Amino acid sequence: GFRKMAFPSGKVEGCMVQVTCGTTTLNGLWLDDTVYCPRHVICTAEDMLNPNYEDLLIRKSNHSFLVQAGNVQLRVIGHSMQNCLLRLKVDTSNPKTPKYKFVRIQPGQTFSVLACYNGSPSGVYQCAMRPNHTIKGSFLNGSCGSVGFNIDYDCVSFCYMHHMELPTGVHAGTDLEGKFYGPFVDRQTAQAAGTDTTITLNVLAWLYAAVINGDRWFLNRFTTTLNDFNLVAMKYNYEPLTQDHVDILGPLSAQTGIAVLDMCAALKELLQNGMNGRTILGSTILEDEFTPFDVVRQ
Amino acid sequence: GFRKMAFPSGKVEGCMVQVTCGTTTLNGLWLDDTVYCPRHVICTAEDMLNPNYEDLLIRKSNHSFLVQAGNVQLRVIGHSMQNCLLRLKVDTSNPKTPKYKFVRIQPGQTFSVLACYNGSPSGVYQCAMRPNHTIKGSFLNGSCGSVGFNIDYDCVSFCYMHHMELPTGVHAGTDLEGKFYGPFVDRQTAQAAGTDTTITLNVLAWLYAAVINGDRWFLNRFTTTLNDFNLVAMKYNYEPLTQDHVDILGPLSAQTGIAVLDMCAALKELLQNGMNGRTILGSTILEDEFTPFDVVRQ
Ligand SMILES: CC(C)(C)c1ccc(N(C(=O)c2c[nH]cn2)[C@@H](C(=O)NC2CCCCC2)c2cccnc2)cc1
Ligand SMILES: CC(C)(C)c1ccc(N(C(=O)c2c[nH]cn2)[C@@H](C(=O)NC2CCCCC2)c2cccnc2)cc1
């Protein structure tokens, strides 16, 4: 009765366009009279190892970028580069543009992803920005340009644009000003995701979700200090817990009457003695892709 | 790299309206000039045990149904009942109506759910029609009228409307002609979901997904007959396997070169010897909410 929920994708579906440059097609985002898309759309098949993007873009004209919004083709009247994004000024302003904002998210935070291919939305799902700045997405060839987003009231907050797959099958991209999450670059190199860790804030939020949904078997009578917990957390590749996290879990702690450091003693016991065949909220592992905000929303 | 993916919900978001009758509010679906919604919206707070819906509806007029499409209120110009649904003819035809169809799904099949409250879409997620004709959804108070759907090309296939929660926390509803899935009724009674079972077709599809995504540890050298497998399946509360299922898994069998009855010997070994700490496609349990169609789509 508790699961990954994506935001309704209608407001973003209206802004999804196709952007073709030579032999390469990928998705872009059309807000007002601008189309944002990954700049590597101008990289050539021969030049994937060491492209110089300033160089490749001086050589382009407006007419080298085909932009198709569904049936209707848009005419480009200008172009520029912002970090790893390209900005294409088009003639028409998108009539379906929503109230929107560009935000840079932090590790642990979650968002919905609209997976698109050739400008055509195909799927929506929820995921989290990992601590190693990758995302565990479901992106196939030509998903580049797909965006990730959160919706509050009527206001879309774009936080991610997809650029590339890394060798482990996870994914890298940028915010909507083109700055990458993590130390990744939009070329073919030998770059790997660094070692990942488990998002302690999110596990604790989930245990509080489980308690609120009536499952309570993992609770215990013990307490722990923050330092005592962080020694167990380091052994099990979990992010250290901070006072800031303890503060964030306040409202959840009040609702259930279970002190945060009590919940931490509970989690520490789970990490040391396994789950021995039981299930939490339907899971047999410790979920770390729900935030404190996500749990309250559900 | 493989997960629950919902269809993009934009085409259904445009048809979500609010329907108020007295003290009760719930969601409805506005296609053309008709609004479909659960008939129990006319049930009164006093009459939940034994309402007579023919009786309660003769007593209503068009002006007892408030219909709000976002800001604008719609005027109702007629009303009738189709099984467990109410049909409200309104003055305006919905301009955002998509190409659409009403279909009745079968157990094991999956669909996307747009969770709505007070006409306002709030979330989208994927689920499956269980063999006991319930759905394991995430519906809170006033989600009634939320619909479930599949999209092919530009054509929305509405298959479920939500009506009620059953005592175990699972959910019952109807197709879009108002006929319930299962033997449930839209009153407060002592009705329970019957015992559920595991969707064997879907587990086998998932194992084929796992193989296609490079995970292969559970394969073995043995084969099984269909009858030999169904004796293990009965012991573990799994649906029997039929020739029709074997036929459905054909394309998946060809793509991976693993014969269906080979995959069944594999699954039988998983059921008898556990997973002993390993993971399939990121899971430590046997997923049964992906169809053969879902696996190919991803
Ligand atoms: C030029 C540059 C920056 C190296 C690049 C090249 C190819 C793509 N990939 C496009 O599919 C694609 C490219 N252009 C249109 N589509 C895919 C991709 O990342 N393969 C990686 C494997 C080789 C090493 C670098 C990239 C992809 C697959 C699945 C999900 N997401 C993306 C992305 C970036
Ligand atoms: C009149 C009738 C048919 C018995 C009924 C009554 C209440 C509702 N429930 C509305 O929330 C609701 C009702 N009208 C507007 N909202 C909820 C519901 O099922 N409680 C059940 C518990 C008591 C026994 C029967 C119903 C609900 C909760 C969470 C997710 N889904 C629905 C549904 C149907």
Side-chain angles (χ1 to χ4, degrees), chain A residues 59 131 157 175 182 185 199 209 214 249 256 259 270 292:
Chain A
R59 307 183 190 255
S157 276
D175 58 31
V185 296
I199 310 166
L249 290 167
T256 70
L270 284 176

Side-chain angles (χ1 to χ4, degrees), chain B residues 24-26 40-41 43-44 47-49 51 53 117 138-144 162-166 171 185-189 191:
Chain B
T24 303
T25 313
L26 45 67
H40 68 64
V41 71
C43 197
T44 36
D47 212 1
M48 293 203 310
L49 275 37
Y53 281 108
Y117 303 88
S138 308
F139 287 123
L140 313 170
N141 291 313
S143 42
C144 320
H162 181 53
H163 292 243
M164 53 187 311
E165 191 169 283
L166 296 175
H171 298 108
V185 296
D186 47 339
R187 334 186 288 265
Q188 185 180 8
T189 74
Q191 51 186 346

Side-chain angles (χ1 to χ4, degrees), chain A residues 25 40 139-144 162-165 186-188:
Chain A
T25 313
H40 68 64
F139 287 123
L140 313 170
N141 291 313
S143 42
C144 320
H162 181 53
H163 292 243
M164 53 187 311
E165 191 169 283
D186 47 339
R187 334 186 288 265
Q188 185 180 8

Side-chain angles (χ1 to χ4, degrees), chain A residues 129-134 136 170 193-199 236-239 288-289:
Chain A
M129 173 70 60
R130 292 322 294 187
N132 68 357
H133 306 91
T134 73
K136 299 186 156 225
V170 297
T195 312
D196 201 25
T197 76
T198 300
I199 310 166
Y236 286 92
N237 200 40
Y238 270 61
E239 285 196 306
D288 78 349
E289 297 220 344

Side-chain angles (χ1 to χ4, degrees), chain B residues 137-151 155-188:
Chain B
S138 308
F139 287 123
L140 313 170
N141 291 313
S143 42
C144 320
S146 297
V147 299
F149 60 104
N150 290 300
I151 307 183
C155 181
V156 190
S157 276
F158 298 97
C159 55
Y160 175 92
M161 180 167 269
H162 181 53
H163 292 243
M164 53 187 311
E165 191 169 283
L166 296 175
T168 39
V170 297
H171 298 108
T174 69
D175 58 31
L176 265 292
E177 289 162 13
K179 188 171 178 231
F180 263 89
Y181 294 98
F184 307 104
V185 296
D186 47 339
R187 334 186 288 265
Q188 185 180 8

